[PDB]
A paper describes a structure:
The [name]-48 carbapenemase is widely disseminated in Enterobacterales, necessitating new treatments for producer strains. [name]-48 is a class D SBL that uses a nucleophilic serine (Ser70) to hydrolyse β-lactams, with a proximal post-translationally carbamylated lysine (Lys73) proposed to act as the general base for both the acylation and deacylation steps of the reaction. Diazabicyclooctane (DBO) inhibitors, including avibactam and nacubactam, act on a wide range of enzymes to overcome β-lactamase-mediated resistance. Here we describe investigations on how avibactam and nacubactam inhibit [name]-48 and two variants, [name]-163 and [name]-405, with deletions in the β5–β6 loop neighbouring the active site that modify activity towards different β-lactam classes.
Nacubactam is distinguished from avibactam by an extended C2 substituent bearing a 1-aminoethoxy group. Both [name]-163 and [name]-405 have four amino acid deletions within the β5–β6 loop, including of residue Arg214. [name]-163 also has a single amino acid substitution (Ser212Asp) adjacent to the deleted region. Crystal structures were obtained for [name]-163 and [name]-405, as uncomplexed enzymes and in the nacubactam- and avibactam-bound forms. Both [name]-163 and [name]-405 assemble as homodimers in the asymmetric unit. Consistent with their high overall sequence identities, they adopt very similar overall folds and active site arrangements compared to [name]-48. The exception is the Ser70 nucleophile, which is in dual conformations in one of the two chains in the crystallographic dimers of uncomplexed [name]-163 and [name]-405. The respective protein backbones only differ at the β5–β6 loop, which is truncated in the cases of [name]-163 and [name]-405, compared to [name]-48.
Author numbering:
A (entry chain B), B (entry chain A): 21 to 261
Write the structure that this text describes.
Amino acid sequence: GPKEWQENKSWNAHFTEHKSQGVVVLWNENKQQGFTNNLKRANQAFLPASTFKIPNSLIALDLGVVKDEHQVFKWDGQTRDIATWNRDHNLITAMKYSVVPVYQEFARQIGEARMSKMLHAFDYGNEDISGNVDSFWLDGGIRISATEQISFLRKLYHNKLHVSERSQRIVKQAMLTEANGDYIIRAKTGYDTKIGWWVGWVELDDNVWFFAMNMDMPTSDGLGLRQAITKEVLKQEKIIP
Amino acid sequence: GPKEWQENKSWNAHFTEHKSQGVVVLWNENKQQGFTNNLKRANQAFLPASTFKIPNSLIALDLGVVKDEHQVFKWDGQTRDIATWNRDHNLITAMKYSVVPVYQEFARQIGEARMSKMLHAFDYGNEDISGNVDSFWLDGGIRISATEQISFLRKLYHNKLHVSERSQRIVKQAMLTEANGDYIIRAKTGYDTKIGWWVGWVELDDNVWFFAMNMDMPTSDGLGLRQAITKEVLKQEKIIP
Ligand SMILES: [Cl-]
């Protein structure tokens, strides 16, 4: 009979088209079935990089470190290399522009003891916060696979994580990336200088498709391939037009 | 001193371009200033038509008539003229397709006493539910102006209405219409066979512009002008590209 996970290697064409290597993982919520071009890489655990902004946001909201999605976190006045980081931000814009320094301040306020306890409650990856509490997701010991990202995102979608419903609703709002009459995408990018991520889901009228992709990213010039390759898979599968 | 409200008649060109007549009202939240092509019509009261799906959804959620945005309202099996109504719906899709029969059922469950009490608590328009409990917003006594729509929507945006924060967040989610890297639109269309409405807001990185427009709508052929004319005003004012 049918399997929980199927391999579709035809999606490899979308990686080889760009001389790139990686994995796309899809989960059809109605059918309770998953699909990927590479089951082994789908289960390989990597640093989450800025995809960690999802759980970090949830913890900061639930503890009151972030009061709501409108609270302003003033620029600290240090000019950094990414121009969009050199301004005031709220939770919405800090997630949109992947503003590391804002989330580093959240993490310090959360603190190591509460961060570790909450990642255990979330069943998040290897739950390991070794390194600094304000950088472990960029250069520390935490590791999560694409299928683990799907599992976490499905709990978030269903308000099943061990934080308040309010915190989960706010973070799902902050994840909003694209919407039109055909679909809604809620997602988060990540990049660690070695691999790039895009994780999230596509809401349709009568189904949800969760996705998690990562790919080798030797330079930042290819960052747009995260979304472009994912969308080629979504188009091939008739999920988006 | 500066003016809270200013008239810009140059926007009339966008109405005359289509041989149409109406009003667009904009509110700049950061500046606390409003703009319209027609101050008189901005403050005249009309049937809300399907824009009433905003308060109707809030009331149904807060009273528990609708449990959440996933609860399914099964099609009653009556084939209606609008094909998208002839299927099962949830709150998200019922708002997207303006599914009148679903909201008529909500209104009957809410009932006259609680509907009247909640519109009073909302300061919604003339607060008058005279007519049929399941059609007064289409052919009964309720009336609201475009400026009153803005005031109501501002309260919703700030979670200041007299229902739970949860109900307000769910309805704001259901209002999602369009999103990209430049803006997010949360809005609701309306149409009563005589007047057309579009009301909602545009979220930018550092500001939000509320809008409410209505226009004479003698035929359904021109329904797309509600968004088209509004977007021409938004583009003229450099709110969207
Ligand atoms: Cl949303």
